[PDB]
Amino acid sequence: KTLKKTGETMEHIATKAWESELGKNTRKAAAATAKKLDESFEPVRQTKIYKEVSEVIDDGESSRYGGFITKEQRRLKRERDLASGKRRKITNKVGGFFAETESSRVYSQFKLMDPTFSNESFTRHLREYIVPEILEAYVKGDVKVLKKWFSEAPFNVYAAQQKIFKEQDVYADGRILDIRGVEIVSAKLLAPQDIPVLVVGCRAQEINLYRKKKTGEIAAGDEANILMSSYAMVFTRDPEQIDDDETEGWKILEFVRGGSRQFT
């Protein structure tokens, strides 16, 4: 109980320091200087070199290390890209290294569907659009998005679960705070038809809480209870309907959530 008591005292001291007249004035003074500095360098940012230099340093792979892309900012980035961009014994063993494997068959199939497909190209699309879109819809109970993305089997599991929440008169309003480790874990063939699938894993920080529909009070979870969940998705691409605006052929066959633990 000492740790809980210390946390309240530490929060109270920080709150008192933040709410202190000197602290509030100091915080306001620091904020004002930062705003002026950004405005001062704003014309510098307008220079074509700054875009050239920033794209050199950042380039957008900083998203590998975390960060959640807001739904609105997620749509504009995809729309803008779509408008312009997206529009002896050793030798025998060494030979077996270069030989065709099951993962080689899976990636080759997806390359016929889309000549631009690659492990690094799809992982960027997963990291930037697909995973944030699905995870945000999953925690917020957005069945309209999941209907397009999920297959018949995982969606019927989701709709069955969301049905239970209806007779409890509760609705899900969760948040995704940060998505990490978005990667293609494995590429396997689904027996016995050898359906090529991509197993995708990710780790996301989230707040899972439910509110009563009629009033809005808390019914489950907590307003401030961050969890480090692990999500496992199995992806396949339909050779047909690859011209879909939203999913462009991708379809989730399995969606598993596990390994949730507290985080901060």
Partner: antibody, heavy 117, light 111 residues
Framework: QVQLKQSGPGLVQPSQSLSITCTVS????????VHWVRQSPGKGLEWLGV???????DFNAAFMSRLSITKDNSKSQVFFKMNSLQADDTAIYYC???????????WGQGTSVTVSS | DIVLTQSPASLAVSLGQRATISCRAS??????????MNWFQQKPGQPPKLLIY???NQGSGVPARFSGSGSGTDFSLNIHPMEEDDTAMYFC?????????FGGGTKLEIK
């Protein structure tokens, strides 16, 4: 490239056994599987059994008591065998490698088998 | 199990026009929304040659004039424009469940 060779005997005596060896080349039996398909002129194409990519077999329910499909990874060979044959078992027997979406993409040259005396 | 009925049993069309072959399945052949219908072509003295797999995908090296369509239980193969070479026996084969079953075959000829 990928190429499947069959080595089986024609003119099988009635109530005897037919054995066909499908020697594959250009791919490994570990990563690909081989179907066994029959084409009678009075019954058309019909599927007998499959040597799955994983290494298990599955047979047609009408031939399950007679069929026997075994493979050998080292020699790249698939072995087919029917215990008893009659006049209606006269057809051309194909071994077909299957790929993604169970596409029988490569086929053997076929083994025309006649059951007579 | 899954009986594939193929129509018509025979067909004769002139060069340059479209030849349509239909396959109708007793059940549905869908797994995960993908229809596992394959189309084969067999010349008289040769093994069957795969044309279409997963109901719409050209086989390796298949000319673009072969097209697969359909979903549910109704499937079709279209040859257009037809050439002199592609006169053969055409089969539809499902791969949803064992046993794999083939269609009756459609003899497609020239006028």
């Amino acid at each position: 490239q990928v190429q499947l060779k069959q080595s089986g005997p024609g003119l099988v005596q009635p109530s005897q056994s037919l054995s066909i060896t499908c020697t594959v080349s250009g791919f490994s039996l570990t990563t690909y599987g081989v179907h066994w398909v029959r084409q009678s002129p009075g019954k058309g194409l019909e599927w007998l059994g499959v040597m799955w990519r994983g290494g298990s077999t599955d047979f047609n329910a009408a031939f399950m008591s007679r069929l026997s499909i075994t493979k050998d990874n080292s020699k790249s060979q698939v072995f087919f065998k029917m215990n008893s044959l009659q006049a209606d078992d006269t057809a051309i027997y194909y071994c077909a490698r299957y790929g993604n979406y169970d596409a029988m993409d490569y086929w053997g040259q076929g083994t025309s088998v006649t059951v007579s005396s | 199990d899954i009986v594939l009925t193929q129509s018509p049993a025979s067909l004769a069309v002139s060069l340059g026009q479209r030849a349509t072959i239909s396959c109708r399945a007793s059940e549905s052949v869908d797994i995960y929304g993908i229809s596992f219908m394959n189309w084969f072509q067999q010349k008289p003295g040769q093994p069957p040659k795969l044309l279409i797999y997963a109901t719409s995908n050209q086989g390796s090296g298949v000319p673009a004039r072969f097209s697969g369509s359909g979903s549910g239980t109704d499937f079709s193969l279209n040859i257009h424009p037809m050439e002199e070479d592609d006169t053969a026996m055409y089969f539809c084969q499902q791969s949803k469940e064992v046993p794999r079953t083939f269609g009756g075959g459609t003899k497609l000829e020239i006028k």
